[PDB]
Amino acid sequence: PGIVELPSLEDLKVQEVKVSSSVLKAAAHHYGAQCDKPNKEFMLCRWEEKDPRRCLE
Amino acid sequence: DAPEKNYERTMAILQIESEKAELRLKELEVRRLMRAKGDGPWFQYPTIDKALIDHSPKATPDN
């Protein structure tokens, strides 16, 4: 069948969150309070597209 | 009995039995077609009911 269409390595370059898991768990409730809207746009796009390649941006 | 009675009774018997013979041959032809194609109401072997499928948002999105 067809060629699978994968995005380029420049499309996956983004500034990562390089903190440990306990750092994330300590600020998890305030992150859920403050950073709501793009996180829920992302999880809505992720459960509607069912394809991570459409959900990169 | 009269010859009219026996004659037309024979015609009734021949009509009934000729219709039964042609419908037996049509019965064989219909059964052959529905077994070969499966597009009729016979030999409808069961498949999975699609009402059993859960369409809820699952634990992971990639499905």
Q: Are A47 and B63 an interchain contact pair (Cβ–Cβ within 8 Å)?
A: no
CA-based nearest residue to A48, from B61, B60, B58, B56: B61
Instruction: Tell me the two tokens of residue B23.
Output: 């419908």
CA distances B16 to A41, B12, B21, B40, Å, are 75, 6, 9, 27
Q: Which residue has 């959900």 as its token pair?
A: A55
Contact B30, B41 (CB under 8 A): no
Q: Which amino acid is at B54?
A: D
* Distance separating alpha carbons of residues B16 and B11, to the nearest angstrom: 9
Cα dihedral B21, B22, B25, B29, rounded to 10, equals -160
Nearest CA in chain B to A46: B61
Q: Residue holding tokens 């009729």? A: B40
Q: How many A-B residue pairs are in contact by the CB < 8 A criterion?
A: 9
Alpha-carbon radius of gyration of chain A: 15
Question: Are A26 and B36 in contact, with CB atoms under 8 Å apart?
Answer: no
Pull the structure tokens for residue A57.
């941006």
Q: What type of residue is B27?
A: E
Integer Cα distance of A30 and B5 in angstroms: 103
Does A47 contact B at CB distance below 8 Å? yes
d(CA A28, CA A34): 10
Retrieve residue B37's tokens: 């194609």
When scoring B55, B56, B62, B63 by the number of chain A Cβ atoms within 10 A, the one with the most, hence best to mutate, is: B62
Structure tokens at B1: 């009995």
Residue of A nearest to B56 (CA): A47
Question: How far is C-alpha B43 from the geometric centre of its chain's CA atoms?
Answer: 9
**Expt. technique:** cryo-EM
How far is Cα A47 from Cα B61, in angstroms, rounded to an integer? 5
Tell me, yes or no, if A18 comes closer than 8 A to chain B by beta carbon: no
Where would I find the H helices in chain B?
3-37
Q: Is A39 on the interface with B (CB under 8 A)?
A: no
